[PDB]
Amino acid sequence: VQLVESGGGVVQPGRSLRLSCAASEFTFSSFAMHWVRQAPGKGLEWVALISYDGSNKYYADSVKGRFTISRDNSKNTLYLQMNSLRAEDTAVYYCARVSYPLTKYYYGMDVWGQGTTVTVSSASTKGPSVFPLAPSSKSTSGGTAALGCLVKDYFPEPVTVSWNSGALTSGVHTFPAVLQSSGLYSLSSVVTVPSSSLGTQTYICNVNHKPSNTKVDKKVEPK
Amino acid sequence: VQLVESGGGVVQPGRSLRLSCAASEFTFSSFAMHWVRQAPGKGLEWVALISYDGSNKYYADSVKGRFTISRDNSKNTLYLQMNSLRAEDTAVYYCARVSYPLTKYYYGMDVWGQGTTVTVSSASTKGPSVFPLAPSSKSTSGGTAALGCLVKDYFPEPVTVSWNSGALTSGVHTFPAVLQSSGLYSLSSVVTVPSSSLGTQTYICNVNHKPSNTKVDKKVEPK
Amino acid sequence: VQLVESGGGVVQPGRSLRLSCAASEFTFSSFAMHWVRQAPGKGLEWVALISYDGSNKYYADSVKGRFTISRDNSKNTLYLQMNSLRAEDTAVYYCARVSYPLTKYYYGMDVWGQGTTVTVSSASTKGPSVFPLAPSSKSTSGGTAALGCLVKDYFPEPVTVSWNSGALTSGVHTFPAVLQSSGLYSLSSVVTVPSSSLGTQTYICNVNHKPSNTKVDKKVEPK
Amino acid sequence: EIVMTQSPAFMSATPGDKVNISCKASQDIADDMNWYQQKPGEAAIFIIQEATTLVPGISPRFSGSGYGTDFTLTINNIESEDAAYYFCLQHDNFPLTFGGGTKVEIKRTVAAPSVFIFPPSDEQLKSGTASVVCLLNNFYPREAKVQWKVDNALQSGNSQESVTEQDSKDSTYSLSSTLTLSKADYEKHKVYACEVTHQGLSSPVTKSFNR
Amino acid sequence: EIVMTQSPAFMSATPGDKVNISCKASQDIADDMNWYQQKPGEAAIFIIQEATTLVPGISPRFSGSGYGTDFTLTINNIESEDAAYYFCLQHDNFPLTFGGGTKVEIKRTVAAPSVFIFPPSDEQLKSGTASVVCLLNNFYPREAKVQWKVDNALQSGNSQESVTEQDSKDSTYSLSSTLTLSKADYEKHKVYACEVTHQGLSSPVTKSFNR
Amino acid sequence: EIVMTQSPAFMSATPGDKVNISCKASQDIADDMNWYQQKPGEAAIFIIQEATTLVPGISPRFSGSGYGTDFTLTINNIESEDAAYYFCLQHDNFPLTFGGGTKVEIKRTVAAPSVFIFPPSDEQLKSGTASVVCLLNNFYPREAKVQWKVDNALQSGNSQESVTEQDSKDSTYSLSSTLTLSKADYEKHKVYACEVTHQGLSSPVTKSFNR
Amino acid sequence: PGQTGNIADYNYKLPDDFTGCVIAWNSNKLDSKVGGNYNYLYRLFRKSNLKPFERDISTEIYQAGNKPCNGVAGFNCYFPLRSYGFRPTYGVGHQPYR
């Protein structure tokens, strides 16, 4: 039993989008389905409900007249169509299954999905700007020193940071990306190493920005 | 009495958009409304009509089956939804109000709106590139000389140009943006100054571009 | 006797499109009409049938409930409306005429059309990237050498390649475009040139990408 | 579909005198039309209702007449702020059809234009492009013709023209002509010129640049 | 519309004791509610059905009680893997409304954070920007305050903070503070500092940089 | 749903000989099928009606025979313009079904292909990509195999193949093989080659490049 | 009564309120000769429907093009009478009946 969602992404205000939920290892044609969403920093909110034969459809008042829910039993898929999206629709969308089969009067969910993300903004895709964090003479403490690299810009959220092609994974912390005033994200990645190892090994930052196809690697610069 | 339109912008062919018209200082629920459009270089063309209760809807033949008109009396709003947009939909859209209230057989408009622009193109957003127009010995005449900067190449048409942070607004002319062969707009801005003031005062171009968040300023370059 | 159809193009999955077939030099109102399609690398498949008056409509099982067929006898036109398009609808569509007139019990066809292409994909319009294949010392053979320019990446199919504004058409071979892993088509165009004439003449590539309004020309660079 | 024809499309208005604008219909519509005025940048104004009734709040200078298929809008005692876009609409039967268009401009004396020339900057040269421009200022009649001459050869391609709108202060005009080529082609030729003819000038004026 | 209130929003769980979470309704719903658990980065897990029945496959430590408007979820003998996001849902009448939220964190001893100061690189300086950062590591309680001081003057702008999630290995924390200004403003001042106060430290610690 | 099977799928035509194409049906249809010819780039042509009648305007060389289940299309005295795409359609009962399709091509003598190679230009190198190509020209039989060898190791990925259609002038062919890789992988290795085997060549030919 | 097809719309037609009988029997070895009996024709198309017990009897070359074919049936000019091809080797459902 598994539910997988896909199709989410960034879209400009006023445009349209379609999300698809795929089910497997169970009889998709005998269950009712729920679309739910969770806005950032807010509690979960119910969105829509559809029955197993597709005759009955229920919508929330906020999304009334703009969203359309549909299903395909032959392909075992669930579709949500969103039109005239606004700034309030930026959230994480979840696909859920009703507990009992062939029932139209229960409305109780038991199986969820990981969900996708939809961002409603009118910005432009940009690439990250890496910058090494040179260790200082005050960084050493108890035979250990800290080093890192600051990452800037990259309006699309997904950025993967790794050290030494993923070999170095001890003592490394990657802080969550924080939004700036201009609307471009930023985060930091710091790892601590022994002070004796300085000047003897090689440490590099491996940033890979999928939306902009950016591959920039920077080695730490001792000063 | 006022009418405000919003929701316009650039959209790729075959996609959808929604425009909203807001009314105020009068009873919106007792009037019929008109949607009109004017293509560039062409006379105005009627598009759609909706009655004060919403049962009667009239569409033009050229926009049948693609455009939907609706209203919300509680929010005092008028909505037009456009689907499967094509090349001939680029125009300026106007929201108008029927002269008489509680009537269904008049079809006469008296109050208009400012309008919004919808562009159907599949280009890429770009930033302007400023280049100063250096004054020469040929540019002086009767103690006065002309100088300017030529903003060039950008897809989003609205670009604001000002000189000396808006202080210098005498003798300055901003020509309409003209399309090029490559499909990107470019205009010029020239202001005349006394020949004695050359090399003694500061003249700069304050080019502000909204969609791309472009911050470029160029000072006049005497040679 | 001629049938011309148009309206095809690239469209995102789940959206709608309309194709129109035009008839001429014969009585359109007395004949029944067929819509057929052929998928890439597959045999032809019948789609729909409409009678000479419009009372009888026949559809195929795969396209039932999503496609609508209609006609206009005054305008001599045949319309097909496509809704909720999926990935299996990418094909070439043909408009056919029934052999006998004023018959509701014969289905043979005798007159076809050239066809239109419909692409169901969610890619973005891109411009081509042309680069030259510099002749090498190994390219010469029997006093003749090979040269050409390679187009790198573009989503829309129609790309025209010509040499010396179409003057040079001897030995030119334009290979069919082949899909890449990322989803952007690429082809090659190579023309043979005598070795002696290679170093004393001028050869340029004339590539015009209509959908993206691209005009880039590259001169062969002997190295 | 009733085709509605408005005449004339363009006109020149003296500071005084009266002006008549004709709106004609291909069918009989009785008095089922309105006359609207729209200044550039603002919303349209409701001027005349039912082809005869003057809307309250408008100056009594405007008048309308006509029944059947021919209708006339009359403006008397023109002033400077009477320059706008006038259009006639019919609302008898669906679909509603508007007229054509009419732009009214205040007429004054002819002024001799002033011509300036600007060569390309080094930014274009290092970019790989060249652009030469020449501009005309302070001329009333729009009939100014500019031609591009390189090596005494006339060029009718790769050249663009732009013209501003009527000046509200003293009713003047401005125009710019741009010629854009590649740096390789720019390097070859040495002399360029833009040659302008205007009825406010006794003789045509040529502005040239050699480098 | 039945508004459902969940309490408390946050808590600290000493391993061993019991924990009660209260879900309250503004109307009578009988046993028409479910309790779900969701760990970060994964899907939600069905925990309790109809406020009394334990879903098979779940540990018997979880329990639920309540009928009418007040309901209680009880977790006994907490372990390190009980840290998740719990929520209560009602499915009585449309529209379906969820509860609030509850995050459970394991409690351990207080640790003294380690503070590091990192100055901007020359790439920012040539780009026209300055970014000074200072970071804290290995402290359990989140009540840590960092302020920015320039010339013994507090700055309340252009300062951003970031904190990592609960550490799975030994339940520690990390934090970073960044201060971004322009190079022109960076050159005006000489000394910068971040001043950190945390309950695990006897006295607050100031980290300064001057160049 | 009547399934129609058409054979053969691909045929080579020696001029002056005869061709038989077989169309078979799973069910029984009596004189309810048509034979169509379509040349690439244009519309189809109505050739044979009801498996016996020859449509006026078509050359009398074509003929058809068969009844009930098996049908045969026969072409005599093949000429160079008989190369097209033939298909058999049944119009008995819904839904209508077509055949598979047959492509006929003229036959001539074997020709030895000419092989050329081209390395990437500096635009790709400064961009961060490499593209190596090699092409074969002027060979009749399409059965030619190309392999890619780097450091005496075969490459079975990131390779693309293209082949042109039949030549109406002298019935020859052309083909291109391309490898697209990253800049780092291109600069790591030094020697590249493509190795072609074709029946018209006594020994296979390897074209190499080192830089 | 109440039927549609080639025979019911372009040939012999029965009223809805029929008051009689229909009689049919196979005559394969009486009408089907070697080579095909081309002596039985049926109307292929027609502008409209016949009236009950009413029969069109004549034929004209229908012009469905733009050029006035001079009494010759070719392309876009059709003759509305196709004949049966009864041969002894056909199968039931395509054999002659009376």
Author numbering:
A (entry chain E), B (entry chain F), C (entry chain D): 2 to 224
D (entry chain I), E (entry chain H), F (entry chain G): 1 to 211
G (entry chain B): 412 to 509
Tell me what the authors wrote about this structure, in their words.
SASR-CoV-2 uses RBD to interact with host angiotensin-converting enzyme 2 (ACE2) and ensure cell recognition. Neutralizing monoclonal antibodies (mAbs) targeting the RBD can inhibit viral infection by blocking receptor engagement. Here, we identify a highly conserved neutralizing epitope targeted by a broad-spectrum neutralizing antibody BA7535, which demonstrates high neutralization potency against not only previous variants, such as Alpha, Beta, Gamma, Delta and Omicron BA.1-BA.5, but also more recently emerged Omicron subvariants, including BF.7, CH.1.1, XBB.1, XBB.1.5, XBB.1.9.1, EG. Structural analysis of the Omicron Spike trimer with BA7535-Fab using cryo-EM indicates that BA7535 recognizes a highly conserved cryptic receptor-binding domain (RBD) epitope, avoiding most of the mutational hot spots in RBD.
To further understand the structural basis for its broad-spectrum properties and the neutralizing mechanism of BA7535, we determined the structure of the stable Omicron BA. Spike trimer in complex with BA7535-Fab using Cryo-EM. The structure of the Spike protein in association with BA7535-Fab was refined to 2.4 Å overall resolution. However, local resolution in the RBD/Fab sub-complex is only 4 Å, further local refinement focused in the sub-complex was performed, and resolution was improved to 3.07 Å. In this sub-map, analyses of the interactions between RBD and Fab were analyzed more accurately. Figure 3a shows an Omicron BA. In contrast, antibodies BA7535, LY-Cov555, LY-Cov016, A23-58.1, REGN10933, 2196, and SA55, bind to the top portion of RBD that block the ACE2 binding, and bind only to ‘up’ RBDs, these antibodies are categorized as Class 1. Structural analysis of the Omicron spike trimer with BA7535-Fab using cryo-EM indicated that BA7535 avoided most of the mutational residues in RBD of diverse variants.
